[PDB]
Amino acid sequence: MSQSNRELVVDFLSYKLSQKGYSWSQFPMAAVKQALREAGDEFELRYRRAASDLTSQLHITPGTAYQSFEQVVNELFRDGVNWGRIVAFFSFGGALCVESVDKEMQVLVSRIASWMATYLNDHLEPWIQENGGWDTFVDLYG
> Taking the domains of the chain in order of start, what are their residue ranges?
1-142
Specify whether the CB–CB gap between 30 and 51 falls below 8 A: no
- Give the separation between CA 53 and CA 49, rounded to whole angstroms: 10
- Give the separation between CA 101 and CA 88, rounded to whole angstroms: 20
Method: X-ray
Q: What is the resolution of this structure in A?
A: 3.0
- Give the separation between CA 77 and CA 75, rounded to whole angstroms: 5
Specify whether the CB–CB gap between 137 and 36 falls below 8 A: yes
- Give the separation between CA 94 and CA 9, rounded to whole angstroms: 9
The dihedral region occupied by 21, where left means phi > 0, alpha psi between -120 and 50, and beta the remainder, is: left
- Give the separation between CA 142 and CA 125, rounded to whole angstroms: 18
CA-based diameter of the chain, in Å? 40
| 117 prior amide bond cis, ω within 30 | no
Phi, psi for residue 75 in degrees, rounded to 5? -50, -35
Q: Taking the mean position of all CA atoms in its chain, how far away is CA 95?
A: 8
DSSP string, 50-96: -S-TTHHHH---TT--HHHHHHHHHGGGTT---HHHHHHHHHHHHHH
Question: Rg (Cα) of the chain, in Å, rounded?
Answer: 14
What kind of architecture, by CATH, is found in domain 1-142?
Answer: Orthogonal Bundle (1.10)
Specify whether the CB–CB gap between 78 and 30 falls below 8 A: no
